[PDB]
Design a protein around this nucleic acid. Structure first.
Ligand SMILES: [Mg+2]
Ligand SMILES: [Mg+2]
Ligand SMILES: [Mg+2]
Ligand SMILES: [Mg+2]
Ligand SMILES: [Mg+2]
Ligand SMILES: [Mg+2]
Ligand SMILES: [Mg+2]
Ligand SMILES: [Mg+2]
Ligand SMILES: [Mg+2]
Ligand SMILES: [Mg+2]
Ligand SMILES: [Mg+2]
Ligand SMILES: [Mg+2]
Ligand SMILES: [Mg+2]
Ligand SMILES: [Mg+2]
Ligand SMILES: [Mg+2]
Ligand SMILES: [Mg+2]
Ligand SMILES: [Mg+2]
Ligand SMILES: [Mg+2]
Ligand SMILES: [Mg+2]
Ligand SMILES: [Mg+2]
Ligand SMILES: [Mg+2]
Ligand SMILES: [Mg+2]
Lengths: 173, 96, 242
RNA sequence: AUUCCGGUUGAUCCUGCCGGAGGCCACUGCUAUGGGGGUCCGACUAAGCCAUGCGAGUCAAGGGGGCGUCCCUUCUGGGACGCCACCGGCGGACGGCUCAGUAACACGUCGGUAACCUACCCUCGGGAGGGGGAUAACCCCGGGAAACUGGGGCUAAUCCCCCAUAGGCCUGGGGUACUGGAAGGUCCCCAGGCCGAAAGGGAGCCGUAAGGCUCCGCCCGAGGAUGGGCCGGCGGCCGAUUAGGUAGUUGGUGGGGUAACGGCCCACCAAGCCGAAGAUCGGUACGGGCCGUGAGAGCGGGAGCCCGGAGAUGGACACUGAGACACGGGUCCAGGCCCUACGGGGCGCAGCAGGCGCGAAACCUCCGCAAUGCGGGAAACCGCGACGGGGGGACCCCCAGUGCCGUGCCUCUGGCACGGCUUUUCCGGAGUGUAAAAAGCUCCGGGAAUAAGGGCUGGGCAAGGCCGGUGGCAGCCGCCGCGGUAAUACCGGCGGCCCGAGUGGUGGCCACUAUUAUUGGGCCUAAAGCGGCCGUAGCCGGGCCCGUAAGUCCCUGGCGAAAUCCCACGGCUCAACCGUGGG
């Protein structure tokens, strides 16, 4: 036979030039300030996988099925994508925008640490943001609900000083 | 820097004690072996001649480092058990 | 093995009952021939180094063993390839600790702490029984050891019985028969590590193995092979079990 | 995403094939800042040929010697210490490499051996009595161009050989103690034979000595373990423009040989054995776990990691050993090549690097035994191109960069002008890291500074009806089709679109395809019902009652290695990757 070969984690469109899909994806890319299409596609694949797990477990029965069902629900609401009282059916109503709201770049922007999405990306990449006492430099990292409030400037960063000229401009917004 | 002892374990079969510790040091470089050894022998009343520092490791975006060291009750036992290279690296003996 | 016996063992092909990391390195210790078989034993080096953690590297593990710090069934073992198996007793007198080797609920070997007094006895399952020159009876136990008895007591011992032996003197002190109501502990198969009492025995023609039915504490009945049932007492266990 | 779009006509509806649009693999054009992880890199043609270095040793606690330094006395010596080769023991049958052969009990799976071998290891029961001998090392003399090799002298052993006892094997006659489902098996007693053990050796203390007390050892028997041998049932390619095949062939009886059963091989007696449910022969291939693709049913492949098989230039054959008809051991034939003083003597990298050749097609003549293991040793230890660490490479996967903010102007997407900010990346240092280094990680100084390309632009199919050349010429074109002096289609400029450290070309497999149809296609006129009928095997077969339990359904024991796949939790910054559990 053949040994294992590592495979891509995302899927490409079936047809590269469809006008409606191009327009929709362009709107998303502009709004969330992503670097290239593949990054976007990555998140899409994640969404699809969740749905494909929900569809398979609805039509199943037995002992392992219940365990996997509760594990899926717990994982989904640990990420902050579902409320605490959601049921399995609610999985089938998630959208691509729901996942994009959990990116570290977006959350840094929404919390008011930056004036713009691009500034948030630069702040993350250069190492000015700490999450739960740890510095992370990946703008696409998905933030868990339990750690969302412990996101601040790094304690060694120049921005961790309210008199810094650039921070005062950020606070002005 | 602040040194915090995580665990101390006794090994009667070898004749040594094994020490795990953390060093907290925001805005500072990774501590040197000499400083850590001095701090440890001050903190636990150890003979510096029979104390070896196995390693000091830093991490990606952390303000702290993790260290592992060993302390022997007899110098001859330490010479008989430990590899030669680790003794040279810690300055206990002299390379030829 | 084109021309002769094998001397090596890859990590990926190691027995499935060990607690070992299969991708950390390339090679594993090939066990020496000895008391138990491959499926129910582990080399002593892994007990010294990986299980108890008294050594970090193999070189300093061998230095500990050569000083005679480890006892298996009350005898000093220096070979790092020595196999240690089911129902054995591992004693460290310098630290004064004792363990018994037992299978897990999923079939892996673990060390169960025991008292010092219990460390002097070992149960042995009578695996076979034969006549030997001078008209004596030889008993062959499950771990490969042997014992001799006179022709007078030939009716006090049969296969599948359990003998409680005092180690290292190897002196018999108790015989536990295999019958309805005996207390058993399962060593292999799907129902490994479950314990209970014997209810029924069944037999089949043409050399197929025979099956026994066991009732546990909660009152459930389950079947297993007769040779996988290890007698440990009359109506209560005579040794500590997890 | 369980999908369609272009092409037959002046126009229409069909059948049917070709092309587009997706994934993966091999070669290749142009172009490239960084890090991490992994089972990637002379497999396809040549299992073709190979210069040089390395890839298997270890034991001084088995034994006599040589040399050196010291202490006691020393004429002489005796000690202790350290190196060296030799005799002797164990290992060199594993590990590493490649896929030529093989359609077969080779491989997968369930069983069997009551028909067999096993050095090293574990438990129990016993034994170690008496003799003998040579030789290496060392000294004298050598021969030969070398590869090699002769004579004489002297010596030891855990070296070799005898005698005894124990023990082993064969056959005949009794007794019934054991295991087992079942005794040509095990145990006991007589009888005739044949074969036939051992090293109380070594080391250290207490011993004045006597002798103990530990450590490592030698031989026999019973059983286990480890590694194998042999056998059976079932399962997995293509061809009828291959139809009959086999004569030690199939079976029986009596033997031989083997570790062991067997036409495995003989002597004699019979005519059997296989085959249209495909024998025989030919073709192509190492088998599997797995891998690619697809909604699934399926279709295609099986180099790299694990398990099994086979081979060492081609074809034959032996010695030693527990194990070989032995890759770095031996002999012959065939065919190449090398050194000779010409009489002779050597060598096959399908081990790691490296070279030539063949091609479209593939890297350094590097560092280390620190980790994981193996062999040797009582042990400390020694060796290992296995394994570990780096070097070269658009091998696969994961995470980033080529700036950000404020105010003005513009054609307001984007660019420009002012003012400010940061340092992932870049340059120079300290620590940590590592067998030693290098990467990586934490700090310090400088500075927007050091960093964007490839294809396309008539329709399918996102994007120009603009400018300049050429003029059925040059050229484009997967398909349909453009170009004949007013070209949105060729060449170039300026614009624009898609993806982006990548993007295009060529070949192969799956999908597209219900163009292989079990699910699920067709045959009046489009490809396709034998000119007609009778009938053998096969397949499909009316209603009720009783029985059985092979198919079929449900429950439960023993199995189908690990790696690979899915899920949750945990460790490397998250991830790729790795660990613990459930499937
Ligand atoms: Mg293969
Ligand atoms: Mg027509
Ligand atoms: Mg070749
Ligand atoms: Mg070999
Ligand atoms: Mg072939
Ligand atoms: Mg004799
Ligand atoms: Mg094949
Ligand atoms: Mg290969
Ligand atoms: Mg090379
Ligand atoms: Mg290549
Ligand atoms: Mg143009
Ligand atoms: Mg268009
Ligand atoms: Mg087609
Ligand atoms: Mg059709
Ligand atoms: Mg007709
Ligand atoms: Mg007709
Ligand atoms: Mg009927
Ligand atoms: Mg049935
Ligand atoms: Mg498995
Ligand atoms: Mg972490
Ligand atoms: Mg995680
Ligand atoms: Mg894993």
């Amino acid at each position: 036979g053949d040994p294992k070969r590592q495979r891509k984690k995302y899927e490409t469109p079936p047809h590269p030039w469809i006008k409606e899909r191009l327009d929709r994806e362009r709107v998303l890319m502009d709004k969330y300030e992503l670097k290239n299409k593949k990054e976007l596609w990555k998140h899409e694949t994640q969404l699809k996988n969740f749905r494909r797990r929900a569809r398979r477990l609805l039509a199943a029965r037995g002992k392992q099925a219940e365990i996997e069902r509760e594990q899926l629900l717990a994982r989904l609401k640990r990420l902050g994508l579902l409320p605490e009282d959601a049921v399995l059916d609610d999985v089938l109503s998630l959208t691509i925008e729901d996942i994009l709201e959990r990116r570290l770049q977006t959350i840094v922007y929404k919390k008011g640490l930056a004036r713009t999405m691009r500034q948030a990306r630069q702040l993350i990449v250069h190492g000015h943001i700490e999450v739960n006492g740890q510095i992370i430099r990946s703008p696409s990292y998905l933030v868990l609900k339990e750690e969302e409030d412990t996101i601040t400037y790094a304690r060694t960063s120049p921005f961790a000083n309210p008199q810094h000229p650039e921070r005062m401009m950020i606070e002005k917004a | 820097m602040e040194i915090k002892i995580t665990e101390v374990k006794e090994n009667k079969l070898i004749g040594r004690k094994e020490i795990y510790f953390e060093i907290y040091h925001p805005g500072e470089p990774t501590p040197s072996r000499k400083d850590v050894k001095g701090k440890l022998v001050a903190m636990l009343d150890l003979n510096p001649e029979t104390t070896v520092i196995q390693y000091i490791r830093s991490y990606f975006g952390s303000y702290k480092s993790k260290g592992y060291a060993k302390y022997y009750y007899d110098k001859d036992r330490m010479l008989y058990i430990e590899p030669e290279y680790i003794l040279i690296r810690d300055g206990i003996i002299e390379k030829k | 093995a084109r021309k002769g016996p094998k001397r090596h063992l890859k990590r990926l092909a190691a027995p499935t009952s060990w607690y070992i990391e299969r991708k950390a390195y390339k090679w594993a210790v090939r066990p020496r021939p000895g008391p138990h078989n491959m499926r129910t034993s582990i080399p002593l080096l892994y007990i010294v180094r990986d299980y108890l953690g008294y050594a970090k590297t193999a070189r300093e593990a061998r230095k500990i063993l050569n000083e005679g710090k480890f006892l298996v069934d009350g005898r000093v073992r220096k070979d790092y390839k020595f196999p240690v198996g089911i129902m054995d007793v591992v004693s460290i007198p310098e630290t004064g600790e004792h363990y018994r080797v037992l299978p897990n609920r999923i079939g892996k070997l673990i060390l169960h702490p025991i008292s010092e007094e219990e460390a002097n006895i070992k149960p042995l399952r009578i695996r076979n029984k034969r006549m030997v020159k001078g008209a004596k009876i030889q008993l062959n136990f499950h771990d490969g050891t042997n014992h001799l008895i006179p022709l007078s007591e030939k009716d006090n011992y049969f296969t599948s019985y359990t003998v409680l032996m005092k180690v290292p003197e190897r002196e018999i002190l108790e015989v536990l028969p295999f019958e309805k109501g005996a207390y058993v502990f399962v060593t292999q198969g799907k129902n490994v590590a479950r314990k209970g009492r014997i209810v029924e025995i069944k037999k089949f023609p043409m050399g197929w193995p025979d099956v026994v039915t066991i009732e546990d504490e909660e009152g459930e009945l389950f079947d297993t092979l007769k040779e996988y049932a290890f007698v440990v007492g009359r109506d209560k266990p005579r040794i500590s079990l997890p």
